Amino acid sequence: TKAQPTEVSSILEERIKGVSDEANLNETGRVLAVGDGIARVFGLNNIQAEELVEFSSGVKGMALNLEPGQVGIVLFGSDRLVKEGELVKRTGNIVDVPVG
C-alpha cells in the first residue's frame, strides 16, 4: 500500500513475535534510514518538539517533524558516521547556547 512501519521487514518480523514493547518507544529508537543529509528514526514517542537527539556515532541532531511512523531528525553533521540500526537516545534538552 504505502509506507508505514509494516512495509519494513525488520520491524514487522519482531511484531509477529509479539514484541511491540521492550522500550524502543520510550527514550530511544533505532535508525531505519540515512542519506541525503537527513535521518529518520523509528520510535521516539516521548519526543518533544524542537528537541536534540544524540545519534550514537558522536553526531547530535535536532528533530523538526514528529510522526508515529518515522520521526524526522535533521542532522548537524556527517552521513559517514551515522548509519542504520544504531540506537539514539533523547538528550532531553531543547537546543541551547551559553549567554554571558
Binding site: 541525503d36 543529509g37 537527513i38 541532531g61 535536532m62 523538526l64 517533524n65 524526522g72 535533521v74 542532522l75 548537524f76 553533521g77 537546543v95 547556547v97 549567554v99
Partner: protein, 102 residues
C-alpha cells in the same frame, strides 16, 4: 554579526578589519558556513537573537545584522523538501513567514 552561507575566507577578512579599527573588543560573530549543513545554517540567526535578548534585557544596547535571511529560506527549503512537506511559493515551504516574523 550573522553569517550564513558564506565562505570562511570572507569572514576571515572582516574580523581582521575590526581588530585593526579597534572594535573586535565588543563584536561577536555567529557563523554557520555553507559547507556546514542546512539545519545549522538555519539555527544560526535564531541563536544569535537569543544572545541579543540577554544584552537587551540587562539594559545594554546592541545591533544584530542578519546576513542573509534569503539564504535562511533556502536552507529551510532543503530540509523541508527532503522531509517531503508541501511547498508554499517558489518551492520555499509555506510557514517560512512564521520563522522570519518570530
Amino acid at each position: 554579526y550573522v553569517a550564513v552561507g558564506q565562505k570562511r575566507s570572507t569572514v576571515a577578512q572582516l574580523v581582521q578589519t575590526l581588530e585593526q579599527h579597534d572594535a573586535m573588543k565588543y563584536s561577536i560573530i555567529v557563523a554557520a558556513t555553507a559547507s556546514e549543513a542546512a539545519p545549522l545554517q538555519y539555527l544560526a540567526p535564531f541563536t544569535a537573537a537569543s544572545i541579543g535578548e540577554w544584552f537587551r534585557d540587562n539594559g545594554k544596547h546592541a545591533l544584530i545584522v542578519y546576513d542573509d535571511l534569503s539564504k535562511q529560506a533556502v536552507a529551510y527549503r532543503q530540509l523541508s523538501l527532503l522531509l517531503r512537506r508541501p511547498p508554499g511559493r517558489e518551492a520555499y515551504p509555506g510557514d517560512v513567514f512564521y520563522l522570519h516574523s518570530r
